[PDB]
RNA sequence: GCUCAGGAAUAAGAGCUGAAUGCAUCUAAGCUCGAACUCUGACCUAAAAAGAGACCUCUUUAAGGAUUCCGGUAAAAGACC
């Protein structure tokens, strides 16, 4: 069907999101963390606890771009929200 | 007799994050390391840098500069002390 190019997030409770000029900050239990994600074609946007981004462009470079920064959302909130852990 | 580094950014290369391609992936964005190479740091030269410089002092019929005179740490002539 259809090659939307549209992504939610779908953000959970605690974290105070924000898109203030094009850093992207976070706060939650966890500490805070903060990281940018302009980049030319792909506009994001945060409300209702969850941050919608898309493109505009079917191009193979959009859909992975818009891939790559609703990963990255999806990371942070999981970050602040509760931490992350290695083993070696 | 003296004759070093340290740092920044990199090549091949090794990784992290990461989607197109639900997974995975060092790569497509992004990030971390990485050479006797490159840059910086030492060293020599450089207001005739035409955007032709900055600051201070002394004095505009003076400050000061040259020539003569006795010389050499300098010297082909000039210059320099």
């Not at 898109?19 to 506009?43: C, H, N, S």
């Not at 919608?52 to 942070?76: C, P, W």
Request: proline fraction near 3%; glycine fraction near 10%.
């Amino acid at each position: 069907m259809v090659k939307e190019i549209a992504r939610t997030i779908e953000i959970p409770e605690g974290v105070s999101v924000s898109l203030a000029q094009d850093v992207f900050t976070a706060t939650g239990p966890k500490g805070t963390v903060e990281r940018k994600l302009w980049y030319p074609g792909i506009m994001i946007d945060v409300k209702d606890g969850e941050v919608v981004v898309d493109a505009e462009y079917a191009r193979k470079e959009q859909k992975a771009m818009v891939g790559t920064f609703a990963s990255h959302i999806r990371n942070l909130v999981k970050g602040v929200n509760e931490g992350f852990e290695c083993k070696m």
